[PDB]
Amino acid sequence: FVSTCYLPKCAAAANVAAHITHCYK
């Protein structure tokens, strides 16, 4: 979830895909 992302510059439009796209476990 982009809302619960760890690194900044991820939440630009509340897009989950744009977050998990590069953000992984």
Residues that bind Zn ion (CB under 5 A): 5, 10, 19, 23
Question: Whole-angstrom Cα distance, residue 23 to residue 17?
Answer: 9
Rounded CA-CA distance 2/13 in Å is 9
